[PDB]
Amino acid sequence: IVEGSDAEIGMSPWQVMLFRKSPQELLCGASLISDRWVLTAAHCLLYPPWDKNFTENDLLVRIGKHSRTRYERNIEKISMLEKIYIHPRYNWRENLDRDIALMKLKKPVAFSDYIHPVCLPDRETAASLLQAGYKGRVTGWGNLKETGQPSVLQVVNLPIVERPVCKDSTRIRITDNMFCAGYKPDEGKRGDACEGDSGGPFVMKSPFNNRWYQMGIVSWGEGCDRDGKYGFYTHVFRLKKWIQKVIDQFGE
């Protein structure tokens, strides 16, 4: 998160650390949508171009976390992935269209002051919410600057940008499964997600039932916090169908 703020305790309960066992390092962000299912970015798991191909073994899941580095002794719970599911038409070769994956924990996670899941959106949530200007919130343990590292989980509220802007900001081919976020330079307000932010969620709180929903999944972008540049997020709503498909197929 670039030009963000430290999380508050219990502020983001769904947040997950994608943790690589060996070496021992965070690989990404992610989210608990249930006590047995975690939602990340397909690229946190597979990326041929970069010789990335995490198998369930290579991974552990850390929930309850606030502090990046330390083992959060009686606060966090560490899970083992049971199964991994990559979006069948995830496009690593091009624009990371359908950047979405699911990980089903080897055993049920227990809810708490620090561990509790986010809602996934309905068609009408998304409608009223994902409108340019509307603010959402990103979290991570990722880079604090394009080119430090946080001690504590980081937060940043960013305005959803009108599609056209997204498009005229890049050379990459944006899809309907994508939305971009940030301030315009006019706007003189800063904040980006950054490296190691992938997989985290873009959540907004519904003002109707004042529930927290994951609108997005931190995907890609160019640099971190670069003027006339935006962060791109997978469109959860857009993939929700893919989502009940696997959960009601082999799920919790």
Binding site: K21, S22, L60, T69, Y71, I78
Partner: peptide, 10 residues
């Protein structure tokens, strides 16, 4: 840079 985790996890 990461502090050590309970081996029960590995």
């Amino acid at each position: 840079d990461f502090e050590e985790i309970p081996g029960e996890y590995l």
